[PDB]
Write a protein that binds this ligand. Sequence first.
Ligand SMILES: N=C(N)c1ccc2[nH]c(-c3n[nH]c(-c4ccccc4)c3O)nc2c1
Ligand code: NA
Lengths: 50, 234
Amino acid sequence: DVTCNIKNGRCEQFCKNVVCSCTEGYRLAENQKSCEPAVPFPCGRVSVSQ
Amino acid sequence: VVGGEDAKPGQFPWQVVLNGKVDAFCGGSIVNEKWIVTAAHCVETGVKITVVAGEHNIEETEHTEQKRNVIRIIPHHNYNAAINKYNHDIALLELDEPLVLNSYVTPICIADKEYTNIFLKFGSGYVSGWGRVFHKGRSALVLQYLRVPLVDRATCLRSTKFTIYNNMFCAGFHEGGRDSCQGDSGGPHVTEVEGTSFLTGIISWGEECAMKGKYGIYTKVSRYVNWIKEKTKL
Ligand SMILES: N=C(N)c1ccc2[nH]c(-c3n[nH]c(-c4ccccc4)c3O)nc2c1
Ligand code: NA
């Protein structure tokens, strides 16, 4: 039913056949799919008002 | 960047500018507080370089800038300028003192080899730098950015007499007009993955900037992920 070959197993960042994971500085959300900041300035985010 | 737009402050907080005998000669990206990733052709001569993070307008002090001296230059072990100046075109720079991460100075994410390749294949990245805004013209004061589409290898190979190796990629437009240029090399090519940008390429080289039938050539970062993570470990 759930596989990384279809929509990345619904993982926001990384998928492993599913178990979702995130890059350093991010933590896996309560839904087990989304990624949330785990530090004040995580990589690859714009935090100044645009 | 030819045909780009002025970035707003803190829009590309991973971007850095390199200065040497000529200021703003190349760009780079923050891997972490002590390390920068750039093109090896930018630092091959092993000259005294300074990095400026938190920069927006290179001729106006905005109080977000962080200058650091480079204490170590690590070109990739397969880089050899006497054989090919633009093949294996990637290098790391160690800063004398760590940067203070904030909204204007933030690292770029780097995924594993597999995911960096998947993100490149999404086919649309953002490039940025203070390079030439016209072919053979004046270089930018405000940081420029541009969305560039990925070009298939076959179209890329037909566009040049030069050799495009498999861990290089083409990006740009069929009719030119918009492209990276001299002064941008070493800077980032990033892919937005659900609001998080990942490094997918290094701005490397090209023939005429923004010419119809020619494309910008970039280094595939997926080819060097294990080397970047290893050498930059804090
Ligand atoms: N057509 C393009 N899209 C393009 C992109 C990057 C470039 N980088 C250069 C370049 N030309 N010369 C140097 C250079 C930089 C530092 C030291 C020595 C040469 C460069 O990085 N031309 C370029 C043209
Ligand atoms: Na400034």
